[PDB]
């Protein structure tokens, strides 16, 4: 059984399978991929700074340790110093956890994790290490600085969050949701994207707060060729508050990023790739999200590349306020065969869109011809690797240029790990079906989720000229029967308006679309099941969704009344929608497991899915879209936070069930990624053991040119900001 805030010694580890994809690449394509990979992995180190105050020091300390002694050499030292093999394994798993999350907080769940061995024994190991013999000042200073925080589970440190009860480095430690909202109002007022920004609040001698909005860039306060960003670098007064806009965040890291993007440009396959890379270079050099948007436009225009990539401060899941971007970058190789199913989904998409439970007036004006590919990841840098992506996030781009849907096939493969024993909360016969179809349904669900889910729905916008992007005169709100009374104004986005629920609410919507359209006797032909096979996917897909909603309670924090993972909160919401429909469609029952410990059972009534489930879901989905399109945050919050509410009300007793969900939880596995190395002429792919030690090695070998320089850089950047926390 698992303990909260530690990675179990026996945590699963899998190695990404990238060899076949890599073998397909031409020499030029390999060099392109090589440099973009380096760009991504460099940039991923910024995520340490975006996670916790101590994370950059812990990375620097681990990096030092394993550069001097690999896992097998360090074993010999550690065991000679009194660690058991089990305690040494705990340290390897911890280090692998830090590497693979780019921080000492889980990317999926936002909870701290600490090494599962005595601090004093680890001290002995670190201070007697070869790293410490070579650089005693550097190693002692690092241990002094981060050793306490490496281990501390004081309540206020256990979860990421704003205010005094959680940790965040998107903001200084004295910031609250109030500060974040005020800053968002400011940012919006200056038409300045939050994505590549942080917010620091410092007080003067009289305790008056001053706000710094700091942009990520290579360049600092010195003048540069650009005008659009530099003209913004100044002080402002906003509702009585002093605001200064600065840049230079992560500068020497982003400098390495841009060096490699420049070199990749030499191997670009076409002018879209060359121009997109030039714009990203401008974005990271100057601190300009407008430049990132221009780059992103070129990227959408680059259709079906052999080497696909994206990079920057992309997703806003981990900002407690919900508008700032965590750095990520990926490089992936097209898989022609696996892409096929999604290409024909594109062949019935424009039609299937009409089947969603809102009027065409709430749907995008022009249906842009969809781009949906299956890729094999070579590099996915940052806090975690998703199974699929739908990007860019810039809604103005999404409506005028379009967007790309990507399914990551060799990541999907890993996620297809499910034993019967690990199939908790299911009755016996339900377990069988699950092992048969979960894999099949995933494409069904993820197909609909990205293309029809994130890809659907119009945002109602009023421009500076009070001229709407819809027909204010004839469009009718199907819930109220009235003409539209609210909309998005200039400079407002989905994230700025819905802030803390934006990510979860939209994931809920996309999931609901997938679940809804999975009922379609036709969609089960595009993926191809057309019978009892088709129906089996259905019962399983819905059984999976309701089981997932129960499992989701792991990611809820009762004391904070707070959900920590957007996708899990969304699945809980869908579960509660289906429970609300009543009529015995779904029940959750407390039980006792064969091990004598509390258990539970999820019961889904297949004979009431279309008669009860589907109209409940249709009504729900309609409501979601109407409030999103109209930017009605009060209504959207009221609706969503309502279903997301967790109580011990009968008959479900979700708070009690949560204790049982925690007792039987399984740790999400760590994924090892390969390296590419430029051995003179040729690029080679380096692969690693599927273990905590292989994961450590994969990072030990990841920066052979300048690893010690990166340790120094992270250490310096952390130290510059230390007063904020």
């Amino acid at each position: 059984a698992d303990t909260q805030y530690i990675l179990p010694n026996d945590i699963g580890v899998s190695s990404l399978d990238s060899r076949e994809a890599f073998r397909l690449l031409s020499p030029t394509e390999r060099l392109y991929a090589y440099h973009l990979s380096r760009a991504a992995w460099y940039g991923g180190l910024a995520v340490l700074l975006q996670t916790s105050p101590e994370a950059p020091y812990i990375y620097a300390l681990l990096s030092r340790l394993f550069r001097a002694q690999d896992p097998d050499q360090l074993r010999q030292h550690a065991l000679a110093e009194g660690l058991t093999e089990e305690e040494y394994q705990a340290f390897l798993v911890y280090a692998a956890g830090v590497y693979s999350n780019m921080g000492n907080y889980k990317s999926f769940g936002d909870t701290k994790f600490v090494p599962n061995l005595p601090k004093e024994k680890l001290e002995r190991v670190i201070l007697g290490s070869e790293a410490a013999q070579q650089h005693p000042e550097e190693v002692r200073g690092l241990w002094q600085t981060c050793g306490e925080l490496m281990f501390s589970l004081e309540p206020r440190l256990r979860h990421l969050g704003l205010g005094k009860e959680g940790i965040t480095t998107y903001f200084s430690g004295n910031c609250t949701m109030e500060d974040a909202k005020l800053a968002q109002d400011f940012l919006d007022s200056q038409n300045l994207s939050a994505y590549n920004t942080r917010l620091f609040k410092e007080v003067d001698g009289c305790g008056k707060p001053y706000y710094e909005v700091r942009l990520a860039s290579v360049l600092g306060s010195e003048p540069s060729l650009d005008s659009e960003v530099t003209s913004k670098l100044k002080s402002y007064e906003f509702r009585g508050s002093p605001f200064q806009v600065t840049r230079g965040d992560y500068a020497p890291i982003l400098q390495k990023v841009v060096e490699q993007l420049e070199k990749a440009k030499a191997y670009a396959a076409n002018s879209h790739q060359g121009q997109m890379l030039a714009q990203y270079i401008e974005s990271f050099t100057q601190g300009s999200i407008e430049a990132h948007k221009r780059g992103s436009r070129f990227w959408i225009q680059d259709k079906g590349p052999i080497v696909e990539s994206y990079i920057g401060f992309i997703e806003s899941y981990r900002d407690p306020f919900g508008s700032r971007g965590e750095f990520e970058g990926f490089v992936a190789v097209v898989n022609k065969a696996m892409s096929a199913k999604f290409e024909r989904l594109v062949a019935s998409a424009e039609q299937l869109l009409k089947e969603l439970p809102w009027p065409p007036t709430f749907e995008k004006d022009k249906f842009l011809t969809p781009d949906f590919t299956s890729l094999d990841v070579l590099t996915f840098a940052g806090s975690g690797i998703p199974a699929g992506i739908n990007i860019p996030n810039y809604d103005d781009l999404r409506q005028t240029e379009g967007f790309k849907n990507v399914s990551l096939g060799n990541v999907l493969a890993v996620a297809y790990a499910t034993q019967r024993e690990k199939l908790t909360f299911l009755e016996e016969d339900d377990k069988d079906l699950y092992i048969l179809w979960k894999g099949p349904s995933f494409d069904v669900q993820v197909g609909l989720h990205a293309l029809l889910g994130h890809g659907s729905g119009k945002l109602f916008v009023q421009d500076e000229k009070g001229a709407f992007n819809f027909d204010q005169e004839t469009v009718i709100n199907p819930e109220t029967g009235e003409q539209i009374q609210s909309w998005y104004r200039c400079g407002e986005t989905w994230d700025s308006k819905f802030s803390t629920i934006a990510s979860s609410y939209e994931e809920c919507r996309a999931e609901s679309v997938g679940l809804y359209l999975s009922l379609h006797p036709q969609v089960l032909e595009i993926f191809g099941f057309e019978g009892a096979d088709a129906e089996d996917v259905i019962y399983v897909n819905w059984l999976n969704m309701v089981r997932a909603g129960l499992l989701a309670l792991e990611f809820y924090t009762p004391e904070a009344f707070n959900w920590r993972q957007a996708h899990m909160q969304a699945r809980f919401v869908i579960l509660r929608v289906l429970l609300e429909a009543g009529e015995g469609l779904v029940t959750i029952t407390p039980t006792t497991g064969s091990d004598g410990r509390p258990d539970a059972r999820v019961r889904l009534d297949r004979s009431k899915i279309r008669s009860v489930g589907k109209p409940a879901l249709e009504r729900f989905l309609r409501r979601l879209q109407v409030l999103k399109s109209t930017g009605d945050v009060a209504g959207g919050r009221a609706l969503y936070e309502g279903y997301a509410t967790v109580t011990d009300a009968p008959p479900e007793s979700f708070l009690t069930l949560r204790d049982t969900v925690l007792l039987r939880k399984e740790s999400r596995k760590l994924i090892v990624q390969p390296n590419t190395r430029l051995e003179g002429s040729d690029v080679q792919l380096l692969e690693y053991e599927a273990s905590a030690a292989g994961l450590i090695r994969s990072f030990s070998e990841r920066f052979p040119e300048d690893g010690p320089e990166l340790e120094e850089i992270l250490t310096q950047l952390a130290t510059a900001d230390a007063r904020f926390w």
Partner: peptide
């Protein structure tokens, strides 16, 4: 947007 699993 990312699809996590």
């Amino acid at each position: 947007y990312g699809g996590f699993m």
